Write a protein that binds this ligand. Structure first.
Ligand code: NA
Length: 308
């Protein structure tokens, strides 16, 4: 396990890791001060990632934050098999790193056997990685979200970048952090804007919506939603941990229950994974935990604005 920038999702992890290694200001703090929740009932039924901090794979709200606060643009480069590796060589020669979108079917990000899950289903899911080396027959990629690295055959790497996925066709997509005129933001300004937006957009109500949809799964013999939800909600745990770390680094005023809320989300994740794998009939219990944390998060956001 590498000491990679965690961010709160694969996209923000890759952007932050790049910024960390290349000394690009503001990107890390804008990521670490995100405060967000979404729920898409239509994605729930298609077994797509349907909740957590942000829709993806690209975090468009984070891109808007990066433009608004730092005048930083994350440029999407599409390419072709004829040009992509050569463009990669030019980017590595200049910058040493390239942010790429890859089909994670073709790599082994996370050790499921750590949670006693041995039936590790391969899925055509797009995730972000950082390319660090191009050799003749192989590449080295860092998966900062999962703290993993691997060497991949050039054949496999090319397949991972031209693949049809659940969320659409990858075409050698790469992502360039760019600015023609940067801006500095203070951490309290970033948090103020995020917490006001969280309350204005009633993001806590999307947690209640999620809880209500969980209550309605009592008769659903397909428990895959609970696994997807488990994976989706790591982003929320990471935001809570990131805010705890910001509190410490910047000696911030926080409401006193931030750790309790992190614990509440970790317990919801544990119960979702146990429901998925252990055949319990506790959708009502999990629904009740989610609806409880929704109320707690609304109050927490109000209190952050009072004390920040
Ligand atoms: Na991802």
């Amino acid at each position: 396990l590498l000491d990679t920038f965690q961010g709160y999702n694969c996209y923000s992890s890759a952007l932050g890791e790049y910024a960390k290694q290349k000394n690009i200001d503001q990107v890390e703090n804008i990521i670490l001060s995100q405060w967000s929740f979404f729920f898409d009932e239509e994605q729930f039924y298609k077994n797509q990632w349907y909740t957590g901090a942000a829709d993806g794979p690209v975090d468009v709200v984070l891109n808007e934050d990066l433009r608004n606060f730092a005048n930083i643009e994350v440029l999407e480069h599409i390419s072709s098999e004829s040009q992509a590796i050569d463009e990669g060589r030019k980017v590595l020669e200049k910058h040493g790193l390239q942010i790429v979108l890859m089909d994670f079917y073709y790599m082994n990000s996370f050790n499921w056997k750590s949670l006693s899950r041995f039936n590790v289903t391969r899925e055509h899911d797009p995730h972000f990685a950082v390319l660090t080396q191009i050799n003749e027959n192989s590449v080295h990629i860092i998966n900062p979200y999962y703290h993993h690295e691997e060497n991949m055959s050039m054949e496999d790497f090319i397949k991972s970048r031209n693949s049809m996925t659940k969320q659409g066709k990858i075409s050698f997509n790469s992502y360039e952090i760019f600015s023609n005129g940067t801006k500095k933001s203070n951490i309290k300004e970033l948090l103020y804007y995020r917490f006001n937006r969280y309350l204005q957009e009633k993001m806590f109500g999307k947690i209640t919506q999620f809880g209500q949809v969980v209550k309605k799964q009592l008769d659903n013999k397909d428990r895959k939603w609970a696994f997807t939800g488990y994976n989706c909600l790591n982003s929320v745990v990471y935001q809570h941990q990131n805010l705890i770390n910001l509190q410490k680094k910047f000696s911030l005023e926080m409401p006193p229950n931030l750790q309790e809320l992190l614990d509440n989300w970790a317990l919801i994740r544990k119960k979702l994974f146990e429901y998925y794998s252990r055949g319990s009939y506790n959708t009502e219990e999990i629904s009740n935990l989610i609806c409880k944390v929704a109320s707690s998060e609304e109050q927490f956001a109000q209190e952050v604005l009072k004390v920040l």
